[PDB]
Short mmCIF file of all heavy atoms in Angstrom, two decimals:
data_model
loop_
_atom_site.label_atom_id
_atom_site.label_comp_id
_atom_site.label_asym_id
_atom_site.label_seq_id
_atom_site.Cartn_x
_atom_site.Cartn_y
_atom_site.Cartn_z
N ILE A 127 15.15 -15.43 -24.69
CA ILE A 127 15.95 -16.24 -23.77
C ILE A 127 17.37 -15.70 -23.74
O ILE A 127 17.74 -14.86 -24.56
CB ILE A 127 15.90 -17.75 -24.13
CG1 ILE A 127 16.43 -18.02 -25.55
CG2 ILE A 127 14.48 -18.27 -23.97
CD1 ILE A 127 16.38 -19.47 -25.97
N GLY A 128 18.14 -16.19 -22.78
CA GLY A 128 19.45 -15.63 -22.47
C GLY A 128 19.70 -15.68 -20.98
O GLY A 128 18.84 -16.12 -20.20
N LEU A 129 20.88 -15.22 -20.56
CA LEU A 129 21.21 -15.22 -19.14
C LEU A 129 20.40 -14.18 -18.36
O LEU A 129 19.97 -14.46 -17.24
CB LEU A 129 22.71 -15.05 -18.91
CG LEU A 129 23.61 -16.21 -19.39
CD1 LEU A 129 25.05 -15.99 -18.97
CD2 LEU A 129 23.12 -17.56 -18.90
N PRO A 130 20.16 -12.99 -18.95
CA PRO A 130 19.24 -12.09 -18.25
C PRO A 130 17.84 -12.67 -18.07
O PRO A 130 17.26 -12.50 -16.99
CB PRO A 130 19.24 -10.85 -19.15
CG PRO A 130 20.63 -10.84 -19.70
CD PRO A 130 20.86 -12.29 -20.04
N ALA A 131 17.32 -13.36 -19.08
CA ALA A 131 16.00 -13.98 -18.98
C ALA A 131 16.00 -15.06 -17.90
O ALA A 131 15.01 -15.21 -17.20
CB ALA A 131 15.55 -14.55 -20.31
N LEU A 132 17.11 -15.79 -17.77
CA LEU A 132 17.23 -16.82 -16.73
C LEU A 132 17.19 -16.19 -15.34
O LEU A 132 16.49 -16.68 -14.46
CB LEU A 132 18.50 -17.65 -16.90
CG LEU A 132 18.75 -18.77 -15.86
CD1 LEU A 132 17.56 -19.68 -15.64
CD2 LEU A 132 19.96 -19.59 -16.27
N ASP A 133 17.93 -15.10 -15.16
CA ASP A 133 17.89 -14.32 -13.92
C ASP A 133 16.45 -13.91 -13.57
O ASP A 133 16.01 -14.08 -12.43
CB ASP A 133 18.80 -13.09 -14.05
CG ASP A 133 18.93 -12.30 -12.77
OD1 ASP A 133 18.87 -12.90 -11.67
OD2 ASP A 133 19.13 -11.08 -12.85
N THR A 134 15.72 -13.40 -14.56
CA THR A 134 14.31 -13.03 -14.38
C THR A 134 13.47 -14.24 -13.99
O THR A 134 12.62 -14.16 -13.09
CB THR A 134 13.70 -12.45 -15.67
OG1 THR A 134 14.47 -11.33 -16.11
CG2 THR A 134 12.27 -12.01 -15.45
N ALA A 135 13.72 -15.36 -14.67
CA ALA A 135 12.93 -16.57 -14.48
C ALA A 135 13.05 -17.07 -13.05
O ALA A 135 12.05 -17.40 -12.42
CB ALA A 135 13.38 -17.65 -15.46
N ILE A 136 14.28 -17.09 -12.54
CA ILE A 136 14.56 -17.54 -11.18
C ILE A 136 13.80 -16.64 -10.20
O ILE A 136 13.13 -17.12 -9.28
CB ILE A 136 16.07 -17.48 -10.86
CG1 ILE A 136 16.84 -18.48 -11.72
CG2 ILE A 136 16.33 -17.75 -9.38
CD1 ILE A 136 18.34 -18.24 -11.78
N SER A 137 13.90 -15.33 -10.42
CA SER A 137 13.24 -14.35 -9.57
C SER A 137 11.73 -14.53 -9.55
O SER A 137 11.11 -14.48 -8.49
CB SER A 137 13.59 -12.93 -10.04
OG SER A 137 14.99 -12.73 -9.97
N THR A 138 11.15 -14.76 -10.73
CA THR A 138 9.71 -15.00 -10.87
C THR A 138 9.27 -16.23 -10.10
O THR A 138 8.22 -16.23 -9.45
CB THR A 138 9.33 -15.16 -12.36
OG1 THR A 138 9.39 -13.89 -13.01
CG2 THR A 138 7.91 -15.75 -12.53
N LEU A 139 10.07 -17.29 -10.17
CA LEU A 139 9.70 -18.55 -9.55
C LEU A 139 9.79 -18.50 -8.02
O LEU A 139 9.22 -19.36 -7.34
CB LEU A 139 10.54 -19.70 -10.12
CG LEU A 139 10.30 -20.00 -11.61
CD1 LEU A 139 11.17 -21.18 -12.01
CD2 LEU A 139 8.85 -20.30 -11.93
N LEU A 140 10.48 -17.49 -7.49
CA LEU A 140 10.59 -17.30 -6.05
C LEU A 140 9.23 -17.10 -5.37
O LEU A 140 9.05 -17.51 -4.22
CB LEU A 140 11.50 -16.11 -5.72
CG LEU A 140 13.01 -16.23 -5.98
CD1 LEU A 140 13.68 -14.88 -5.76
CD2 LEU A 140 13.65 -17.29 -5.10
N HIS A 141 8.30 -16.47 -6.07
CA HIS A 141 6.96 -16.23 -5.52
C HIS A 141 5.88 -16.64 -6.50
O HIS A 141 5.89 -16.23 -7.66
CB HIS A 141 6.79 -14.77 -5.13
CG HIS A 141 7.77 -14.32 -4.09
ND1 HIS A 141 8.85 -13.52 -4.39
CD2 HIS A 141 7.85 -14.61 -2.77
CE1 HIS A 141 9.55 -13.31 -3.28
NE2 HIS A 141 8.97 -13.96 -2.29
N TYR A 142 4.93 -17.42 -6.00
CA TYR A 142 3.97 -18.10 -6.84
C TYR A 142 3.10 -17.15 -7.64
O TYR A 142 2.42 -16.29 -7.09
CB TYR A 142 3.08 -19.01 -6.00
CG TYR A 142 2.05 -19.75 -6.82
CD1 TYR A 142 2.43 -20.62 -7.83
CD2 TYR A 142 0.70 -19.57 -6.59
CE1 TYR A 142 1.50 -21.29 -8.59
CE2 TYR A 142 -0.25 -20.24 -7.34
CZ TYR A 142 0.16 -21.10 -8.34
OH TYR A 142 -0.77 -21.77 -9.09
N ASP A 143 3.14 -17.33 -8.95
CA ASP A 143 2.26 -16.66 -9.89
C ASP A 143 2.22 -17.60 -11.09
O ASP A 143 3.18 -17.66 -11.85
CB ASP A 143 2.85 -15.29 -10.24
CG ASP A 143 2.04 -14.51 -11.27
OD1 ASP A 143 1.46 -15.11 -12.20
OD2 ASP A 143 2.01 -13.27 -11.16
N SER A 144 1.14 -18.37 -11.26
CA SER A 144 1.16 -19.49 -12.22
C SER A 144 1.31 -19.05 -13.68
O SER A 144 1.99 -19.73 -14.46
CB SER A 144 -0.06 -20.41 -12.06
OG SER A 144 -1.25 -19.76 -12.44
N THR A 145 0.69 -17.93 -14.04
CA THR A 145 0.85 -17.39 -15.39
C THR A 145 2.28 -16.92 -15.65
O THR A 145 2.85 -17.28 -16.67
CB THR A 145 -0.12 -16.23 -15.65
OG1 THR A 145 -1.47 -16.71 -15.54
CG2 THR A 145 0.10 -15.63 -17.05
N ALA A 146 2.83 -16.12 -14.74
CA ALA A 146 4.22 -15.66 -14.86
C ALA A 146 5.17 -16.86 -14.85
O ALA A 146 6.12 -16.93 -15.64
CB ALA A 146 4.57 -14.72 -13.72
N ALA A 147 4.90 -17.82 -13.97
CA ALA A 147 5.76 -18.99 -13.82
C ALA A 147 5.87 -19.80 -15.10
O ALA A 147 6.92 -20.37 -15.37
CB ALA A 147 5.27 -19.87 -12.68
N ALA A 148 4.79 -19.87 -15.88
CA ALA A 148 4.79 -20.64 -17.12
C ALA A 148 5.82 -20.10 -18.12
O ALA A 148 6.55 -20.86 -18.75
CB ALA A 148 3.40 -20.67 -17.75
N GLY A 149 5.88 -18.78 -18.24
CA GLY A 149 6.88 -18.14 -19.10
C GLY A 149 8.28 -18.35 -18.55
O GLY A 149 9.20 -18.67 -19.30
N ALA A 150 8.43 -18.19 -17.24
CA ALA A 150 9.71 -18.40 -16.57
C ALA A 150 10.20 -19.83 -16.77
O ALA A 150 11.39 -20.06 -16.99
CB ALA A 150 9.59 -18.10 -15.09
N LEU A 151 9.29 -20.80 -16.70
CA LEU A 151 9.68 -22.20 -16.88
C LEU A 151 10.08 -22.50 -18.32
O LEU A 151 10.99 -23.29 -18.56
CB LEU A 151 8.57 -23.14 -16.39
CG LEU A 151 8.40 -23.14 -14.86
CD1 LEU A 151 7.02 -23.63 -14.47
CD2 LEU A 151 9.47 -23.98 -14.19
N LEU A 152 9.43 -21.85 -19.29
CA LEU A 152 9.84 -21.98 -20.69
C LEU A 152 11.27 -21.50 -20.87
O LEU A 152 12.05 -22.14 -21.57
CB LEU A 152 8.89 -21.22 -21.62
CG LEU A 152 7.52 -21.87 -21.80
CD1 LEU A 152 6.53 -20.96 -22.50
CD2 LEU A 152 7.65 -23.18 -22.56
N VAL A 153 11.61 -20.38 -20.22
CA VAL A 153 12.98 -19.87 -20.24
C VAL A 153 13.91 -20.85 -19.52
O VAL A 153 14.99 -21.20 -20.03
CB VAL A 153 13.07 -18.48 -19.59
CG1 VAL A 153 14.52 -18.02 -19.45
CG2 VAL A 153 12.26 -17.47 -20.40
N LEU A 154 13.49 -21.31 -18.35
CA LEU A 154 14.32 -22.19 -17.52
C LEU A 154 14.69 -23.49 -18.22
O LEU A 154 15.86 -23.92 -18.20
CB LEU A 154 13.60 -22.50 -16.21
CG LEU A 154 14.29 -23.48 -15.26
CD1 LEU A 154 15.62 -22.94 -14.77
CD2 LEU A 154 13.37 -23.79 -14.08
#
């Protein structure tokens, strides 16, 4: 986690991918 991870997380959530989104949401 961190600000770079948050940037990644936002980017991931822009387009639906439920597996990727789960990790992004943990970061978020």
Side-chain angles (χ1 to χ4, degrees):
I127 59 181
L129 294 186
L132 180 50
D133 186 32
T134 304
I136 294 164
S137 300
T138 287
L139 295 182
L140 290 172
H141 300 105
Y142 180 61
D143 178 324
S144 68
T145 298
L151 290 159
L152 287 169
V153 173
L154 176 63

